[model samples]
Target chain A: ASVVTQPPSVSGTPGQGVTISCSGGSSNIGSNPVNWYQMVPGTAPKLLLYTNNQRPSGVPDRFSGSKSGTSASLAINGLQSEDEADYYCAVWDDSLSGRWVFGGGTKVTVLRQPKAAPTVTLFPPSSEELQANKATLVCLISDFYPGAVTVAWKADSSPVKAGVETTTPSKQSNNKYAASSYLSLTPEQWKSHKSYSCQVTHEGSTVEKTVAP
Target chain B: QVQLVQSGSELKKPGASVKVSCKASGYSFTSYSINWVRQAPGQGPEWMGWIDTNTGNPTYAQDFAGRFVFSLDTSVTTAYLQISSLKAGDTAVYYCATYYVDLWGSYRQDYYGMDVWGHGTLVTVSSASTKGPSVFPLAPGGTAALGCLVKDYFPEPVTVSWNSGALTSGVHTFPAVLQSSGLYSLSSVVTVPSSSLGTQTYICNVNHKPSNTKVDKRVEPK
Candidate 1:
């Protein structure tokens, strides 16, 4: 099966400005406005940015959002409770019936979701190949400055540790970093699992996944 | 949160008619909207139209601008989609979508898409709801009785209601009649108090297919 590639999650403290860019290079983002959305649990998705940063009537300026190149971003300045929903960048799907293509959504954790606009993106642990316990997990990150990047793991939504790490900034070239996680669990633990999650966070967004348990 | 369960498969001959019902549960029946959609065996999806869960107003698709009818119950949040003069081409799984459209942003039209879906009912004109239920009552100087008929039945039980707010099961009393097959006929009757003649609009409504409601009614003066 072919792998589905997605943008890394952006995370940060509630108030700092975190920016997340879809970074699809020069070919796609040219003639389009990147869109954004905020999705809460158990509800239909809402369109946050259309044709780029333009919002529908009544949307607050504190919930600043924008788009550039192939990626669109939602920046919530002084984020609030409602701002803690999952955020996503949307662009015209060149592959489908112009169905909006979505970037991996950035989930906000409300340490008081600030309404302050903070840009966010993931700077994965150098995209290095690593074996942590029972499985192999890789992180892909690109075009983001160092120090601004936050990489970590959580098992079933709880934080865990990494086994191997390698990351480098492409100051002179297009940015790209690759990393992986490996856990050392027995075959039984791997097959009859409860649940597990591999996550990466940025200033304003957090990405998480749970294994089918 | 109103979940809809539809009827079983239907088999109908050409030129017949069909009506489906969507019984709702979970929330105020009139607070949300219900949309109708058709899905052929292998096709994607088609938006037939929607009915206001509050008002009984129904709008048809431009193509169906002529015959397709949409209706609903604000009190029940239930809806009905009907296609009269159904042809074999009408054979398909019909589904119900919930929630009214608020016209998201400046899309120029209401935001319409099936958010929640029913399991769908396969309707063939010959099927129960296709034949539909009908009645012609026999009236006496004292009162009148209409025939009560039950058309289709899914694995689940259905309901029958009247405009006077009167409710009954499928059982109904009708004036004696015969079928072309030379058999005793089937129908339902609503007794009208002689004094209130011409003042009642009696409707025999069937809760059958999901996203569709069927009705047969009459209103007159005393």
Candidate 2:
């Protein structure tokens, strides 16, 4: 099997330069032409580089790719906020099972922070709704820049399974990001009068909103 | 570049059989390999198995056992996937993809994923389908026996494999048992070592002949 590996994440500032490396072997970057793709959150993957060092028309020269014995590198010069995304390397490999092997993705994040911390709020289901037999604790994080954030949950201070379903940070008309995560809770658990906290992390700031029901 | 042109769609009965064809053009037909893929409604594509273009070897994935067959017409540069005694659950579009392997390299041949895809040939299996397959980990942790339990499937013959890659050399498959319902039930087990299991996927691909369908169940890790 042709396998490719990449760093999980890399962070840098605007106007900085960053190089992402893709390593593969035998059936891939080892001897064949390698390609790269860019995957922005919530969007499909777009081809970034083709053949080892050539960019498709319209890709800036600042974004360059090179291959050197079983490995390939994608260097983004003068990295901008717009360069924040996931990068994947792909190679044409022929094996008994299949072809076209893709490397695990690398996320590129701009170190710059959003203009403001996200507003965090918790919404608990109503007593009538809970007693009627169902509920969810919804954590809402809105008005944050960078469109990347984390939401964690804690019940009575003991970290609970966030059991969370979160939306990919969505861009708002105001150039900020908004997203929500929800945790399903049984009515009995809701009626126990426990305090639950929804903590949102945007950039380096943390906001924890507590709901006691 | 390679091109795979598949045959037209088919409507088959619960006890019928169907063979789909994928004709290759634009390259040496017998130089590379071609694998079959199944796409069910609202699901991702499943790798069925691949046929060696050189020696015409047929390898089945865990689910595409007994009744599913991969063959070739080298003279015509075509490959065929045939399923017999199909069931209704076998209804889905089947695609063939071409991949090139670096066979002469000093390192192990680097094999790529399917790069050239064929127009899928649709197969319709009506409500006559029986219960589908069930896949589970036979044990805990890395060296577990991944079992694919195909039960109450119509007709005789089914095929199975772990990753649609080659089955392990000493894998065990229990003989198919005849059920009172006139269907067959069988199980396949492949013990995989942690070294071999590193992030690799396991799927059960079964070709049920009576219903004329190829179906797969992805084995989730415990």
Candidate 3:
């Protein structure tokens, strides 16, 4: 269990309001100051509220925070698309000597937005590696929304299990998400295989890209 | 153009001390507090402490109090983190971030947001016997492919280079992967011409800063 607890998710539409609650114990939020952070995937977490409810400059008046007892709340009014991010509450715990405790983040989502599927691109092994005994295949997924996707690899219509690595999806500067998967194989296997495919499953739909030797 | 440029990584032995520097640019350094964050391998970020750039006052998180020291050089727009009596568990990446704040009429400072970040500095404290990477052939009797594996190293930053005989265009290096034993491993691939595989010597050079050591492994294809 986390020292600080929060809801797993919350949602609101544009112009609507939502509140995220953080619960802790006496040794933490009850006796110490509470701070809140807003985190967008792939970027550094930004401090949203400090000393309980004080907002920093440049943060809009629509965002507010409050704390009572061992609980804290961060409210967002007139929520915008940009407000969609993960929120985490932190406090300095006097327990166990001393430590910093943070809530398992609450992900805030803005509703009514158009869903965007990722653009999939498969890159075959480099020509230089074709002469070698080893080759690597790269699958790039970009410009997706909602940020959750499952990636799989196949060689010659069969699932590939070994030497396949996929990275977690990360938010990009354009507000979209991007991820990559790598497949490693020997040249002999590559030459013997007719096709290698990268399959991406997002939002209940599957998209794939295949490269031929 | 606000930027936080940090110093290079540090490789120190256990019980030693190391200082990491973070230099701010394009902003008034004293206007914001500098917060220090730490991330151990395969772990989430932890708040270590922060220092007021204006007054040079530091407030450390509970676990960081004794051996961790945060200081500032306002004139040069730099913040320094000095860790004394380093231990093997001190192997982690330290980042300096700008703590933006707002001051009210009565000068009540309301701090929020870490808008700018320094590209963290990696600190490695180790007493391991292994100092360098090991090279292996991808296939028996060697083909055009060779693999250089650097494993069991602390705090993960190593440079892998190849000799002039190897083609730079065909070199591919992967990011360091953290092992369960609190160590790290990285791999790099080198491709040579098939015709020159047997006649020429291919050397993989690894530079590990923590041990101040460099090892070169030569391979000759048959």
Candidate 4:
């Protein structure tokens, strides 16, 4: 078994309550305070409980913690759609060369249907000459549903296979999703005034926007 | 691999008392100190204090004073947390965390955060207190030193930033200093022109992350 372990995943309705547990052995969980974190799909994980049960000031009271022997648990009361995220448990462990051990993490899923599509916006290169010959186009996708979308790039109607960087979809605090993609080009390439576009595909629908040179 | 094995659970009532034990093995126990963290029911962890296993020196957080004591039995290679006159609110899990230090300048060992922890001991005490942090200004010489005071706060996110009115072209910040009481004292320094003293205001902004509440301190030379 993993030194520190949590359930694979937990699911609940909007108003229901869910409990996640982390178990360890004589070396770690049996002897340490367990800290918990809430990691949304794409954002940095927030510290939910430290030393077992103490909630950070901004955490709602409905989210509680408790520990018994070598096991600790986090219980979310009156769960909401926003609470759908991944939960992880961590403990300072001496058994592993005195390091911190983390649970595999538990995904919390709320039983709800998808509601919205992605909003795609394309931004042109920073004006007036960011650099003599270098330019970057940004594609922002927000308010996506189901938290899964793909972004593709095109230069002069040709498939853009290079210089395209995209981020994984991140779930916002409001339960919406957001992501960004970047396209880089040299000054000479951008001065050519070729049409460049960002295509965001979500839920079988595709939206394309051109970055005006 | 170091192992911190703590004693099992206990069921005590209000006005009762309980003593918990943490036994450590693997690495040299005396090489590092041990800190205690408390997770009250439904709350985040609170840094209680630490005990120097080598010297047996004990420190306590302000909120933990009076009723709590940290003791060590070197012969048995064990540490103890004894809570007297416990209340129902005191019902919480206590974990023994080993403190670590990094070698600084090759010769100095600087205290860092705890690296290893024992499983928690559940002690019931009938419990609570909440307070924000404050800030102050130190005397100014060639350069000004600003200080922010934080106390009795959870390990939640608290941040410190420097704001200036004068041309803050040159500024520096020092690492946070953890007091014996488990509070944090942060210092920030900046070199400002002598003429900008009273006319310019230097601000130190502290944001308590959980609440997103900000406390700002303005300083000017007298």
Please report the candidate that would top TM-score against the real structure. 3
Give the TM-score of each candidate.
0.31, 0.45, 0.49, 0.33
lDDT of 2 by residue, B1-222 (tens): 456778998867677899999998877777777767675532334557687888888776666768789999999999999999987557778878664333222211113335446777888754334544332233224453444555446555677665565556535454554332334556555556755543666676677665666766665444
What is the Cα-based lDDT of residue B80 in candidate 2? 96
**Residue B143, candidate 4: how far off, in angstroms?**
73
Off by over 4 Å in 3: A12-16, A41-44, A96-100, A111-167, A171-213, B1-19, B24-34, B39-44, B50-60, B65-75, B82-93, B97-222
Per-candidate DockQ values are 0.01, 0.02, 0.11, 0.01
| Location of the lowest summed lDDT over 10 successive residues in candidate 3 chain A | A125-134
Question: Worst ten-residue run, lDDT, model 1 chain A?
Answer: A121-130
What are the per-residue Cα lDDT tens digits for candidate 4 across A1-213? 345777755767688999999888777778878878786533433567777887756789889998888888999988897898878787766574555566766767775755577766565554322443446565666667666566789887888767665655666655767776667677677768667889987756789988655
- Cα RMSD (Å) between model 1 and the true structure? 26.6
- Candidate 4 chain B: 10-residue stretch with minimal lDDT: B103-112
Off by over 4 Å in 4: A1-213, B99-113, B125-222
lDDT tens string, model 1, B131-217?
Answer: 333222222266433323332233223445566445553223222221211122223335455565555455665554442545554
Q: Write the residue-wise lDDT of candidate 4 on B1-222 in tens digits.
A: 557888988766567789999998865667677878776532345567777777788766666878999998888889899998877557678878663233212121112235455767876442212334544442233433332333234333566666733334544333333222223333344456566666766777767765456777766543
Candidate with best DockQ: 3
Model 3, range A15-116, lDDT digits (tens) per residue?
A: 999999999999989998888878775565566887888876667888999889999999999999899887888887788556667787777878665668
Computed on alpha carbons, the lDDT of every model, listed in order, comes to: 0.46, 0.66, 0.72, 0.65
